[PDB]
């Protein structure tokens, strides 16, 4: 961002048309391949934010003074702001449409009429081709000028409206009235909305005029029969809007469907391990499958409609042609080739215009909504400031008999206060008494009702929430002040920030995110101390702070530093007011007791009652794997064949028109009066009915082929996507737990959440559009070549140049987009930081610096975006110029061989060549979108392929025994277990045996290995040494399901799945209802279930956060007891409810073997045996009765 003047101000008209400045920039980019912030130009003075802001605010103020703040319309204001640019744009666009209508139609008509003639006159046809080239070039350049003007106007409007809106929000009264998210969104996308408004509306004012001109030309050429050809668009475009609405409705359905699916995915992956030792995978697998099939059906419907509404333009023109010409020929009217091809070319023209218009209409509607939202955010109450000076400077704060009512309520009544400088005043009261209300009123967010308030000097404020600036430590401490060393060191040492400095290695220069509450409080106090204002107000600075350090800070700062300035103390603790100079008690918005502290206990008021209370790019591999997932090359071949059939059938219809016209009379001898001669008239052929029938067949083929191709393509793409989904789910559910132990769940959730919907709702769309575009262009070029091969050998080098231009433009576009994103991110970060702490900024009167910073950010954010848009326009201009060269050369080629080809063939050739225009930038953009989507699918493919496989659920070891386990005897032998490779071993030579029907409690320090036994016994992580024997059978020789079906545990936290009680208890329904009722009555739950009319169908939400904690624990332990497993282990299950839970557990499993992982000694007291772990090893093994009787026993150490 280093430049003297922008190239815009120094560019002439020709440079403005060819974008020579961006041509040089793109050449430099291609030379280097990378861009930097320094290589781009800064904003010119014409589009500076401040000047536009001044103009917009002046106009808004004038309108407000004119009509009043009751019926103000920002539409008129923006209209006056951009009137001149709008009239220039509409005049230029009118020129564009006039040229693009007068050139092709008139030149084609004259050229075909000359071709139909016999005599050769090259002096005329060369003039005609020169004229048509002139019109094409003029139309292209005028369109470029229109778009440049629209871009400049849109940039100016967006900048002005954004900065004015920011000023308005910075001058806001209350922030809790409206949500923060929408307030951020009002400054995030409204600029894009205004850009779309300006540019695409100025483009919108270009369609109806050319449509009407085309209708008039068609009717005057043909006769009263042109209405049939002009009514097709009227009868059709309602169908397109209907299809759009239906697609929107189906999308609204599938978004909710996929929200449900992703919620289920998050729920299942949250407790992946919990499912892992239960072997319940199949149930959630099937549930995900049925949700997937529902969403797949909705996607099928949406895809049918989308593929219906994709490529109607050639279909529309073909339908218009067939209907019009069948009607014209059946009713005995005559015709020639020239009229036909003029008609089809004009039809192409209105198809272009009417394809341009609709998104412009939509953008205008969105703009209307956005400006209405802005008007809503323009008419709130503005925060006032009390600037009435006091009688004397000694009385810094003065206020006399003022009452207030919170805006949303009278709170404060009949207040009389007076505080002098240098006096410390404390505030005493309860929550809701009015402390916050009074400090806010002094802050100036409250209006003035009675008397007056006198405020002098600056203010210092410390927040209850302790707002933190989004910067490093050294930035927010100065808060716009110059840096000092001794003062900063003294302030830092005063608030005990040294531990904060030592803990973080780069604490002095570490950006703070938008830490601990005490750290925020202390840095807030440090900032207040460094601020050095006049009046220092303060509320509860030691609420979240520790008592000792808070007291030390108070003594070292308030009693030392601010002994000579006015300080207001507010706190919820009344023990600090003993040494305060003056104490004010605040109660129910009215002053009741006040004075000195000693007198304040002397008066024995309500203060004393509460005072004593506290005292007591991607390679071809991705394409190949996607094709393979699609179902092999056969589906690819079928879809290509369908597209080729569609375009070839359109070619068949047009070529049949040509053949019909060329057939002529067919050597028919007719009488025209007193003599007979052969007359080349269409109506004299006795086989025109056959041609009409072939036309009807062509239209039927049109419709049927389009429908079949759309349905087949949508079905194939959705089949491929569902196959990929099923493969990924199958692999991920057979994945190791180390995946989740190492990688956070956020990445996997995002892979399931956003990437999947992205591919499903984007890749088919762009892929199909790109395929249709390329196949249409290729078929038209193939036709023109099939008429003239010299055209093909001429357009070869043009193809090479097009490839070069595409490469250069792709490089430049990618670089520009990267720069735009990298400059956009800190912009949003700054908006969030500013909106977070508005009250403090208003209190310190630092508004101007914030707005200046925001203007800087807006400038260096909008520079690259404007450059990027201009680059896209430049690419479009270049491709349009290439197409103009093509049209010129094909016109000259048609001229040169006059008299040797039938006129109908020349007409079809020129019509197709005209159709070739404006079909290249579409291809480039679609290619870019397709490669981005394939980059996403490449990421998904790498993610799925980089997985691993565990041991199979079935192994050659077979089932151990139908009655396994026979007993509850387990013996350990030298257990060596480690969490990961190279990780320190958690298990180190531990061997023990447990007799059946015994309660065993494992007690040890954190990380001693108490948790490791759960994974060790379940074969979850493979043993690194030794063996584990249960009933004399080694665990490693049993299949995963075989032993996972006979083991059950209870976790520390209740695990409740979304669904029903029946699903949450036993999804497989392998138990009878009476057994469930017996389990519930054993767990004492029928009393809480029977009264519900959905007793076994009671819905359970995520984590089951609707019952009490006792109900959750009871249902969980029921989910353990119904499995009747021989071996069951608890892991720290944790007054009356707790005792009930413990007694229920004691009475429940008295007939099995109990292993207890409990961190509480009191609960495990009286157990049969106690297990002690010494950092992965056992030191004592005996009954706890003899262990508590031994002082030297480790078990007796922590008991005291």
């Amino acid at each position: 961002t280093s430049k003297h003047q922008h190239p815009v101000d120094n560019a002439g008209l020709f440079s403005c048309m060819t974008f020579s400045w961006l041509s040089s920039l793109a050449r430099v980019a291609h030379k280097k391949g990378e861009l930097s912030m320094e290589d781009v130009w800064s904003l010119s003075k014409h589009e500076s934010s401040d000047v536009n802001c001044r103009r917009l605010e002046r106009l808004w103020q004038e309108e407000l003074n004119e009509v009043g703040p009751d019926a103000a319309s920002l539409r008129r204001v923006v209209w006056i702001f951009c009137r001149t640019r709008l009239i220039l744009s509409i005049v230029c666009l009118m020129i564009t449409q006039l040229a693009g209508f007068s050139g092709p139609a008139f030149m084609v008509k004259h050229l075909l009429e000359y071709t139909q003639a016999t005599e050769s006159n090259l002096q005329y046809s060369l003039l005609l081709v020169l004229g048509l080239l002139l019109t094409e070039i003029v139309r292209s350049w005028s369109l470029a000028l229109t778009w440049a003007l629209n871009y400049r106007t849109g940039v100016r409007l967006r900048g002005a409206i954004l900065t004015m809106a920011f000023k308005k929000i910075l001058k806001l009264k209350n922030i809790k009235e409206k949500s923060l998210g929408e307030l951020i969104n009002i400054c995030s996308n409204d600029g894009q909305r205004m850009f779309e408004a300006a540019a695409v509306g100025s483009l919108l004012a270009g369609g109806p005029v050319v449509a009407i001109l085309g209708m008039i030309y068609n009717v005057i050429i043909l006769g009263p029969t042109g209405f049939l050809g002009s009514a097709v668009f009227i009868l059709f475009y309602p169908a397109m809007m209907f299809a759009s609405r239906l697609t929107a409705y189906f999308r609204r359905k599938c978004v909710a469907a996929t929200d449900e699916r992703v919620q289920k995915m998050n729920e299942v992956l949250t407790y992946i391990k919990f499912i892992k030792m239960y072997a319940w995978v199949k149930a959630f697998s099937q549930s995900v499958q049925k949700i997937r099939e529902e969403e797949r059906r909705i996607l099928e419907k949406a895809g049918y409609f989308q593929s219906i509404t994709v490529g109607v333009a050639p279909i529309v023109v073909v339908i218009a042609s067939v209907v019009t010409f069948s009607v014209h020929m059946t009713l005995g009217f005559d015709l020639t080739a020239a009229q036909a091809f003029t008609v089809v070319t004009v039809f192409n023209s209105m198809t272009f215009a009417l394809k341009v218009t609709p998104f412009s209409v939509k953008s205008l509607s969105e703009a209307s909504v956005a400006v209405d939202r802005f008007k809503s955010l323009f008419l709130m109450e503005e925060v006032h400031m009390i600037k009435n000076k006091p009688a004397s400077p000694h009385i810094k704060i003065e206020m006399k008999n003022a009452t207030l009512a919170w805006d949303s309520q009278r709170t404060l009544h009949s207040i009389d206060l007076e505080i002098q400088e240098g006096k410390l005043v404390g505030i005493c009261g309860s929550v809701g008494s009015g402390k916050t209300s009074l400090i806010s009123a002094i802050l100036g967010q409250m209006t003035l009702l009675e008397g007056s308030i006198a405020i002098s000097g600056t203010f210092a404020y410390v927040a209850q929430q302790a707002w933190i600036l989004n910067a490093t430590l050294r930035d927010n401490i100065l808060f716009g002040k110059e840096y000092d060393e001794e003062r900063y060191n003294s302030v830092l040492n005063s608030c005990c920030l040294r531990p904060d400095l030592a803990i973080l290695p780069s604490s002095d220069l570490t950006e703070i995110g938008e830490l601990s509450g005490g750290q925020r409080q202390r840095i807030s106090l440090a900032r207040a101390l460094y601020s050095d204002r006049s009046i220092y107000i303060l509320d509860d600075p030691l609420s979240a702070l520790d008592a000792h350090v808070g007291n030390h800070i108070f003594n070292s700062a308030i009693r030392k530093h601010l002994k000579s300035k006015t300080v207001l103390f507010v706190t919820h603790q009344l023990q600090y007011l003993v040494d305060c100079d003056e104490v004010i008690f605040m109660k129910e918005g009215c002053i009741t007791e006040r004075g000195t502290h000693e007198e304040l206990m002397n008066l024995n008021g309500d203060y004393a009652t509460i005072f004593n209370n506290l005292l007591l790019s991607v390679p071809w591999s991705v394409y190949g794997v996607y094709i393979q997932a699609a179902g092999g090359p056969l589906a690819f071949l079928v879809i290509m064949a369908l597209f080729m059939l569609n375009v070839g059938s359109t070619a068949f219809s047009t070529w049949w028109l040509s053949y019909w016209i060329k057939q002529g009379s067919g050597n028919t001898t007719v009488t025209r009066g007193n003599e007979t001669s052969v007359s080349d008239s269409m109506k004299d052929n006795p086989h025109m009915q056959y041609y009409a029938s072939i036309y009807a067949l062509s239209m039927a083929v049109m419709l049927i082929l389009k429908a079949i191709r759309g349905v087949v393509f949508v079905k194939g793409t959705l089949r491929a996507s569902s196959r990929l989904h099923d493969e990924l789910f199958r692999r991920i559910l057979r994945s190791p737990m180390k995946f989740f132990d190492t990688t956070p769940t956020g990445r996997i959730l995002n892979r399931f959440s956003k990437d999947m919907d992205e591919v499903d709702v984007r890749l088919p769309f762009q892929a199909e559009m790109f395929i249709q575009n390329v196949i249409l262009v290729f078929f038209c070029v193939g036709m023109i070549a099939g008429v003239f091969p010299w055209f093909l050998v001429a357009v070869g080098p043009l193809v090479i140049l097009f490839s070069v231009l595409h490469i250069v433009s792709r490089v430049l576009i990618r670089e520009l987009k990267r720069l735009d994103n990298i400059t956009q991110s800190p912009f949003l970060s700054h908006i969030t930081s500013s909106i977070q702490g508005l009250a403090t900024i208003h209190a310190y009167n630092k508004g101007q610096e914030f707005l200046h910073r925001y203007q800087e950010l807006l400038d260096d954010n909008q520079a690259p975006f404007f450059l990027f848009t201009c680059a896209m326009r430049w690419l479009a201009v270049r491709l349009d110029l290439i197409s103009i060269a093509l049209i010129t050369t094909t016109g000259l080629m048609i001229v040169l061989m006059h008299g040797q080809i039938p006129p109908a063939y020349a007409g079809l050739a020129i019509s197709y060549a005209v159709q070739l225009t404006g079909l290249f930038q579409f291809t480039v953009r679609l290619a870019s979108e397709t490669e981005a989507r394939f980059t996403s699918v490449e990421r998904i493919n790498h993610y799925i392929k980089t997985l691993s496989l565990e041991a199979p659920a079935r192994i050659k070891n077979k089932a151990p025994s139908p009655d396994w386990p026979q007993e509850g005897e387990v013996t350990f032998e030298n257990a060596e277990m480690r969490y990961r490779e190279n990780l320190p071993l958690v298990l180190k030579k531990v061997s023990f045996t447990i007799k059946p029907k015994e309660k065993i409690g494992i007690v040890g320090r954190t990380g001693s290995g108490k948790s490791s036994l759960g994974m060790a016994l379940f074969r979850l992580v493979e043993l690194s040494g030794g063996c584990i024997k249960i009933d004399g059978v080694r665990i490693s020789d049993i299949g995963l399901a075989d032993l996972r079906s006979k083991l059950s545990i209870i976790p520390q936290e209740p695990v409740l799945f979304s669904g029903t009680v029946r699903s949450n208890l036993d999804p497989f329904n392998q138990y009878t209802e009476d057994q469930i009722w017996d389990a519930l009555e054993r767990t004492h739950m029928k009393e809480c279930i029977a009264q519900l009319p959905l007793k076994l169908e009671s819905e359970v939400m995520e984590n089951g956060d609707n019952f009490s904690v006792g109900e959750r624990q009871l249902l969980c332990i029921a989910r353990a007891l119904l499995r009747h497993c021989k071996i069951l282990i608890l892991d720290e299950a944790t007054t009356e409810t707790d005792l009930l839970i413990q007694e229920t557990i004691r009475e429940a499993f008295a007939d099995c073997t109990m292993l207890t992982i409990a961190h509480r000694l009191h609960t495990v007291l009286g157990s049969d045996r106690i297990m002690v772990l010494a950092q992965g090893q056992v030191v004592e093994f005996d009954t706890p009765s003899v262990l508590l009787s031994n002082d030297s026993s480790r078990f007796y150490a922590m008991f005291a």
Binding site: A199, S244, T247, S360, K362, M769, T869, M872, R873, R925
Partner: peptide, 14 residues
């Protein structure tokens, strides 16, 4: 929409 992306792909953001 197919028509919505028609005008955007000309010279505007997608």
């Amino acid at each position: 929409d197919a028509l919505e992306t028609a005008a955007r792909a000309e010279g505007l953001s997608l």
